[PDB]
Design a protein around this ligand. Structure first.
Ligand code: ILE
Ligand code: ILE
Ligand code: ILE
Ligand code: ILE
Ligand code: ILE
Ligand code: ILE
Ligand code: ILE
Ligand code: ILE
Lengths: 153, 153, 153, 153, 153, 153, 153, 153
C-alpha cells in the first residue's frame, strides 16, 4: 500500500499543501529542483494515488452551510460494510470510515440548517438496512478545517 | 458570516472541487462564462474566505501514515478554548473543533504508527492544562477521505 | 420561518411574558405606543404564530402532581417521526421533540405519582412500535418552571 | 405543598390553559358558574401559587431563536444547589431543576445560533464553580412546545 | 396504600426491627404500653401488610454463599412486567423491582459461586422472552446487609 | 468465614425464613427433631453469625415511605472504604456494599418523598469527602422486597 | 475443581514459570528435592491440569504482529455460550471468556495490521449468530505480556 | 522492531507453542531440519526477543485462584505511563498495557477470592497517584486461557 517517497517528494507535497495551485516553476525555484523532475514527480504521485486530487478547501460557514457535524453510527455487525457503501453515495457526507471503539462508523456531514440535518438523518440515513443508532455531535466552532464537499445536492 | 453566492459562484466551486488546479480557461468553456469574470469571481471567493485555499488531497495510507484516528477530548469547561488553541499547534492535528454532546473537543490526527499515536496522546496532548480524558477511535478503512496535513512534523 | 420583529414587537413580547393577561391599555402606557397599534401588533404576532397562545403557567407540585420527569427515548431510526406523532397524543406529555446526541427523542411528563409514571411508561409508551428504550430522570426540585399541561387526562 | 382543588377549580384551570386571556365572563358561560365565584377562585389559585402567572407562549423558531437545547450538567455533589442558583440568573435558561440519574442538573436554553450557544456554555456557564461537565442535546424539531423566556438578554 | 400509624405503632416497629422475636411482654415493659394493646397493634400491622412477616436475617457469606450480586436488566419495554413476573419465581432472586434510569429492572441475587452465577444468568434468566441485556455488579464486601432468601434451591 | 451447616441447620433456616417468630416447638414438630436440639442449633447459628438477627420485614410503601431507591456512588479510589464507613451511619441506608463494575459503592435507601431524597443526597451524602458522583434509580414497583430499616431518623 | 498443592508443588510451579524448559535436575538442586519426586510432581500437575502445558511466550510485535487488541462483545443473552464456542475456533483469538459487567464476552486477539483486524471483526466474527456489538481497544504499548497464539492462520 | 523470520522459524515457533519443552531432536524429525540449525534458530529467536521465554501455562482455577478479572483503569492523562510502571510491580498483574478507547490502561489480574480482589484494588492500586477510576470484569468461565503469573505473592 505505502508508495516509496524521497526528500524531494515530501518537499513537493509540503508545497502543494501550502498552495494546491502552485506552478511547477514556483516549486522548482523554491526547492532548487528542475521544473521537469517536479512535473514528473507530481504525475507519479497522482498516478500512484498519493495525491488523490487537488481541491479548493471551502469554509462551509462562509458558503452558507450552518451545520457541520460528526455522526457516530452503530450498525448490525454483518451489515457494516454495506451500510458504508450506501452512506458514501450522499453528497452531504464529507468523511466516512469504519472505526475501532464504541461506534462502528464515523462520518462528517455538512448541511444548511438543523431541519436539513434531521431530514438527512431520519429520511435518508435511517432508511439504510443495518443502521441501529446515530449520535450527532454538532461543531459550534472549527479551529482547523478539514475538507467539505459542498453544492453537490 | 455567510458570503452572497449566485449560480455561477456555485458552478465554479463545483468545478474547483472536481479539480483544484483547473485553469480559468477550462472553467470558462465548461460553464459558458468569460475567463475574466471566472478569474474575478475566484479572487473574490478567496478574498471573502469562501475558498480558504487550494490543496493537494493526500492519501495518508499511501504516504506511509498507518494511523488515521478521531480523538474525542473531555476538558475542564473553563479551559476548553485554551485547550483548542494548544491542540491547533500540532501538525498531527488535521481537523479540530468544539462540539455538542458527551465530548467537548473533536479532532482527526494522522501519525505513522501506534507508538507515534501513544507519544502524541501521552507526551504531547496530555501535558495541556485542562485535558481530563481522551478517547481515540482508529480508522480501519476510509470510504471517503477528508483532508490530511502530512510531512509537517 | 423567522417572522420580522421590531423594537416595539419585542417590548410587547417582554410585557406579555411578565403578565399574559396584561390589557393593551397597560402595555400602551408602559411603552408609550397607542393601544391601537399595540392591539394590531399582538393580532399579527398571534396570526404569524410568534405567540402560539396565552396560558396559565401552573405549578404542578401545588396542583397535586408529585412527578415531573424528563424521559429520553431511544427509537428505531426509521420510526422516530411516527413515535413522536404517537407520543404527542398523551396529555401527560408537556414538551416533546427530536434531539441530537445519544437519545433520539426528549420529553417532559407530569403525572400524579410513581405508579402513574410506571403505568404511563410501560402500559402506554411501551406499546408504541419503534420505542427500544426509555430513561427517566425525575425532578426532585425545580428552580425555573417551564409549561405543564395539567388535568387533561 | 398540594393546594386543595375541586371540580370547578380544575375546570377553570383547563379553560385558562386553552386561552390564558379568557374573560371570567366566558369561563362563567362555559362551566355554568358565576363570574364572581370564577374571579374569586382564580384569585385564590394565584394567591396559593397553583397559577404561578399567565404568559404568552412564544414559538422561539418564529421569534428568530434557531437553537432550543437541553443541557445535562454534571456538578460536584456539594455544589449542586449553588450551581442551580447561579444558572437561574441567566435569561437564556427557560427550565432548570435537579434530577435523579446519570446527570445532576437539567435545563432547557434558547439562544439565537450555534455561536451564542458556545458563548453561553463556555463563557457563562463554565465560569460557575462546581460544573464538571455539560452535555447539550439540540432540538431539530419540536412537536410539543413548553415555555421559552425570550428577548430578556 | 399508606396505613395510618401513630407514635406507639412506630415504637413497636422500632423494637421489632431491633429483635424480630421480641415478646409482647418485653415491648410492653420497654414502651410502657399494655401487652394486650401491643399484641392487638402487631396483629393490625400484619393484617394491614405494614409487617409483611418476620424473618431470620442471614449472612449469606457465613451460610456458604460466596456471590451476592446486583443485576441490572435491560428489557423490551412492552415485556418489562412479564420479565419481572418470571424473574420473581427464582429463589436466587432476593430483591426485584422496576426502576427509573438507564436500566429497567433491578435485582439482588445470592448464589454459591461464580459458576452458579453464570448458570443462573445464561441458563435461567437468558431464556426469559424480552431480556436484552444484563449487567452484574458483584459485592466484594457488605457494610449493611439487606435480606437474603437462602437454601430454597 | 463459612460456618459448617448440615441438613437439619438448613431445614431450621428455611422455617425461620418462612416465619422468623416460629416457636422451637413448631420447628421440632415440622422437621421431627427435638425442641432441645432445635434451640441449641439456633443458638449456635446466632452465635456463629449465620443468623445476624431476627426482624420484622416492613413494606415501606405501606409505612408511608414513598421513595425506595438504589444509589450507585462513584468515589475517589483511595477513599472508598472511608466513604462506606460514613454512609453506614445514616438510617436512610438499608443495604450498603462495595461492588465490581462501573460504580464503586451500591446502596438502597428509603425516604418519605422526593424532597427528603434530594436533602439526603445533597445535604448529607454530598458532604462526605471522596464522593465524586451519585446515580439514583427510583423503584416504581417492587415484586420482591428486601429489608428496610424504617422510623430510625 | 482446586487440586491439592503443597510447598514443594508451588516451588516447582515458580521455577517452571521462571524457565518452562528447566531440567528436573536443575529444579532438584535449586529446591533441594530429588529429581525423581520433582519429575513425579510435574507429571501429576500436568495430569491434574494445573499445568495445561508448556509454551514459548512470543512477543507478537517482534514476530511482525502489529495489532494486539482486546475486544468486548455484546451478545444475545440466550446465545452467549454458543457465540464463545464459535469464537474459540479462530487462531487470532488468544484469550476468551465470559465476564460480569457491561459486556458479555472478553477476548484478546493478535493480527498483522488494521486491515486484518477489520476483516477479522466484520468478515469472521460478525457472521456469528448472536453477536450484537463489538468494542475493540488496541494496545499501543504492553508493559506485561500474556500469551499470544501466533502463525496458526 | 519486527525480526526477520522465514518458513523454518515459523514452523519451530508453531511446535514450541504445541509443547514448550519439545527437544530440538523432536523438532528436527518433525520439520526435516537438522537438530543443529533448529538449536541455532531457537537461540537467535530468544536472543532477538521473539521468544521472551518458555513457561508452564497454569490453570489458575485448578491452582486455587478463584478470581481472574480484567480491570479497565482511567488515569490522569499526564500520569498514564507512571501508573503503568507502578502497576507492573504487582505479581497479581498478569497482562498490562496502554489502550485506545474509553479506558487508558487494561490489565488481567489473578487473586484467590473476592476479599483479595478488593484489597488489591482499594489497598494497593488505589494508592497509585493518577488512578481516577477502575472497572473490574470478573471471568465466570474461560474458553481460551492466556498466561497467569501465580504463587509470586
Ligand atoms: C472494526 C471495528 C468495529 C466496527 C467495532 N467498532 C469494534 O471496535 O470492534
Ligand atoms: C459547546 C458544547 C460543550 C463543549 C459540551 N460538549 C456540551 O455539549 O455542552
Ligand atoms: C436527529 C438526531 C437523531 C435522532 C440522533 N439523536 C442523532 O444524534 O443522530
Ligand atoms: C438528587 C439527584 C443527584 C443530583 C444525582 N443525579 C443522583 O441521581 O443521585
Ligand atoms: C419505569 C422506568 C422504565 C422501565 C425505564 N428505566 C425508564 O427510566 O424510563
Ligand atoms: C472493588 C471494585 C472497585 C470499587 C471498582 N468498582 C472496580 O470494579 O474495579
Ligand atoms: C455472566 C455475565 C453476563 C454475560 C453479563 N455480562 C452480566 O454481567 O450479567
Ligand atoms: C493512548 C490512548 C489513551 C490512553 C486513551 N485511551 C485514548 O483513547 O485516547
Amino acid at each position: 500500500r505505502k508508495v516509496e517517497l524521497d526528500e524531494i517528494d515530501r518537499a513537493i507535497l509540503r508545497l502543494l499543501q501550502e498552495d494546491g495551485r502552485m506552478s511547477y516553476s514556483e516549486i522548482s525555484r523554491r526547492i532548487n529542483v528542475p521544473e521537469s523532475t517536479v512535473r514528473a514527480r507530481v504525475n507519479r504521485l497522482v498516478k500512484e494515488g498519493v495525491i488523490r486530487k487537488f481541491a479548493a478547501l471551502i469554509n462551509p460557514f462562509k458558503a452558507g452551510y450552518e451545520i457541520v457535524a460528526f455522526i457516530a453510527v452503530d450498525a448490525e455487525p454483518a451489515k457494516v460494510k454495506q451500510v458504508v457503501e450506501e452512506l458514501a453515495k450522499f453528497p452531504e457526507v464529507d468523511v466516512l470510515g469504519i472505526v475501532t471503539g464504541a461506534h462502528d462508523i464515523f462520518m462528517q456531514v455538512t448541511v444548511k440548517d438543523l431541519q436539513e440535518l434531521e431530514r438527512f438523518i431520519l429520511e435518508k440515513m435511517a432508511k439504510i438496512d443495518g443502521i441501529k443508532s446515530t449520535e450527532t455531535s454538532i461543531l459550534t466552532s472549527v479551529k482547523k478545517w478539514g475538507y467539505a464537499r459542498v453544492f453537490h445536492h
